[PDB]
Design a protein around this ligand. Structure first.
Ligand SMILES: CCOC(=O)[C@@H](F)[C@H](O)c1cc(Cl)ccn1
Lengths: 412, 412
């Protein structure tokens, strides 16, 4: 058998806001967080915009001195993590600290830091490399610094599965609790890849929208005029908790995590298969894991990256899995508003899926002006749609054909 | 209910060999793989040596067309994975491909590629970044590329837990099989951090041995004259398989994986606690997980990094866990010979722990001329010790206070 897992705390930095309720308000109003990137000469780049975190004050979380040691992606992950633990109301003690762990991941980790230290290395040689270069850049330092700050002695690890990271981190944290390896996990992801290397890296693959004239219209999942994804920064963290542990201390429960699916496409390094066979296996695995029939799904937070092939693959996957129910569920891409937070995408979209269940509302797919061939599902074009949502799915598909699906359900 | 997990295939690149048997011959003969680094000018660096993989031929594994797109750490990870899968005798079919996954991790990933593309970006501009830069550098692409080439559609992920990566990767892959998420997993890790950024970054922390005039004597775990770790490159991969699945196909079984422990120190970003409290908590979790009396432990493959604090913490941890039995078991650091393969350390060391069981021999800790204050266990100084080994333990500790222990035993 298996223990039940609920969500008792959430935290976020996104292009829409410095916390969950501000981000969520932007989502339900169809606001874009996409803008030209500031304090950075992107003249020579084919993309000059994305989703930046605006007005982040790390000194709400850390001393100036401790913040200087950490890449922005670690600062963001720590901010989301501290918020989520505060939101949960959990009291860490000598009696429970071995039962509380962390799995905060990243797709691309410390690019800003790598970039600044390459400058020093090429210009001045190795003796100007910061002593904190390695520990201040490694992807497991959100889990590390969080565990040290809060005295957490449970399972301590970090996933890196590109654009699937946040979904896998949360799913595998849920397994830790379900199988009795922990009672509480802080799980999610963080990303800050708006450096030359991030915009340049994805730019060289021609994976990014180049709609520089209209940044807010660039992210247009399933729209016939989409031209690639929008690079965004931020973090999501959830407090996952064994149900009886949550009930005993009187925790506020947002929702239950009932299902986790993984699959590999085994198809291509960066492109999904046209028929989304991989995404379909992963969703079927997630529903089987939850003991749910495809008919019980009401809302899907799609990967919905605004790439030609990715968006169409997800429509095919959903038609395949859900058959005669495919039109009855609502599916939206909040990436239409947030852009693509890469490893943090699954973390902020799990929170948006939980909030869809709390507020009984499907967030919009903004910019869906002209649905493409075969994109005839309920994609919640333009505006939020209040509706019955008992069961919400959150999908992530990433480089290497790696797939993740989370299944959340209303808790009462 | 929880299924049993066995090792049916192993694969390796190390500073001692281009496969498992050649590496193991070097381990048993007390041979060093540490030498001045040839692939770059290190005259400006405080450390100019490490454990290089010598004479690696990627055209034994991949087309030159594919190899050119991939960081060395991915090439090393794929080579070890291919060796492991072939060694297993396993045939991938439509009947089993959904039940075979991969978890190959790395501490740092494609640093050589990142540095090279950083050079291009700063000297020439963004239009000179490779289109293959992101898919060819990011840590999950060993798992990705392996799944694409072999058609593995099971769980596809990657851990990044610094120097604990290989141990965590193997442990969590065993849990996937134990809990029924997969029947087969390819798991381990790969590292190639020997570039200016890597040697410079660890050098800036003063974490590396600076014994440039005698590199083979540099890695001297528990020796009074140790001055930090030796940086090394390579890969370890194991095929983990559910017991009845292995039995049904007539697989050769090297050993059974009976125990896995994780724990966080919650102490310091980089330093282990002097008393080894987190490592003690981790080993006790692993021994309880294996249903063992601690007196059953015959051999420990220590982390044994050759740092002042790390080495003494491990003695303290082992004395605390094993009490008087601490004096009866054998513990050695194969890092004395291989140096520190970082995220690949736990993977190659898990293989050495399994071969210690097959061959009934404790590998030596070379260079242990003058054991330090309190390092008075059987540390297998200088020469391999033939001995009874029913149960072998492999430890890893990392940045972020992240701990892993694997427990292996003979299968009859
Ligand atoms: C010192 C920590 O090193 C890392 O983890 C880097 F590889 C980093 O995360 C990264 C950056 C890029 Cl540009 C592509 C893929 N990964």
């Amino acid at each position: 058998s298996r223990r039940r897992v609920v969500i008792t705390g959430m935290g976020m930095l996104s292009p829409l806001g410095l916390d969950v309720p501000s981000s969520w308000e932007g989502i339900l109003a169809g606001r874009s967080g996409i803008a030209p990137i500031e304090h950075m000469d992107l003249s020579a780049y084919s993309t000059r915009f994305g989703g930046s975190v605006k007005g982040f004050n790390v000194e709400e979380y850390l001393s100036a001195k401790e913040a200087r040691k950490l890449d922005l992606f670690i600062q963001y992950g720590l901010a989301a993590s501290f918020q989520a633990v505060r939101d949960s109301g959990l009291e860490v003690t000598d009696a429970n600290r071995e039962r509380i762990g962390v799995s905060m991941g990243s797709g691309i980790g410390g690019l800003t830091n790598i970039e600044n230290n390459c400058r020093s290395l090429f210009e001045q040689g190795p003796r100007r490399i910061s002593p904190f270069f390695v520990p201040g850049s490694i992807i497991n330092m959100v889990s590390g610094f969080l565990s040290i700050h809060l005295g957490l002695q449970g399972p301590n690890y970090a996933l890196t599965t590109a654009q699937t990271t946040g979904t896998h981190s949360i799913g595998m944290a849920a397994r830790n609790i379900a199988y009795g390896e922990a009672d509480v996990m802080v799980a999610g992801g963080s990303e800050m890849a708006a450096c030359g290397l991030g915009l340049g890296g994805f730019g060289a693959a021609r994976a990014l929208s180049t709609r520089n004239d209209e940044p807010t219209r660039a992210s247009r999942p399933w729209d016939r005029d989409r031209d690639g994804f929008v690079l965004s920064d931020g973090s999501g963290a959830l407090v996952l908790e064994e149900l009886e542990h949550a009930r005993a201390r009187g925790a506020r429960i947002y929702a239950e995590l009932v299902g986790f699916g993984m699959s590999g496409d085994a198809f291509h390094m960066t492109a999904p298969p046209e028929d989304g066979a991989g995404a379909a296996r992963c969703m079927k695995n997630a529903l089987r894991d939850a003991g749910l029939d495809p008919r019980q799904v009401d809302y899907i937070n799609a990967h919905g990256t605004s790439t030609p092939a990715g968006d169409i693959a997800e429509i095919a996957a959903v038609k395949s899995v859900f058959g005669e129910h495919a039109h009855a569920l609502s599916m939206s891409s909040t990436k239409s508003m947030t852009g693509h937070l890469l490893g943090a995408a699954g973390a902020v979209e799990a929170i948006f899926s939980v909030l869809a269940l709390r507020d009984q509302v499907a967030p919009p797919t903004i910019n869906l002006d002209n649905p493409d061939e075969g994109c005839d599902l309920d994609l919640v074009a333009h505006e939020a749609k209040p509706r019955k949502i008992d069961v919400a799915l959150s999908n992530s598909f990433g480089f290497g054909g790696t797939n993740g699906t989370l299944v959340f359900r209303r808790f009462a």
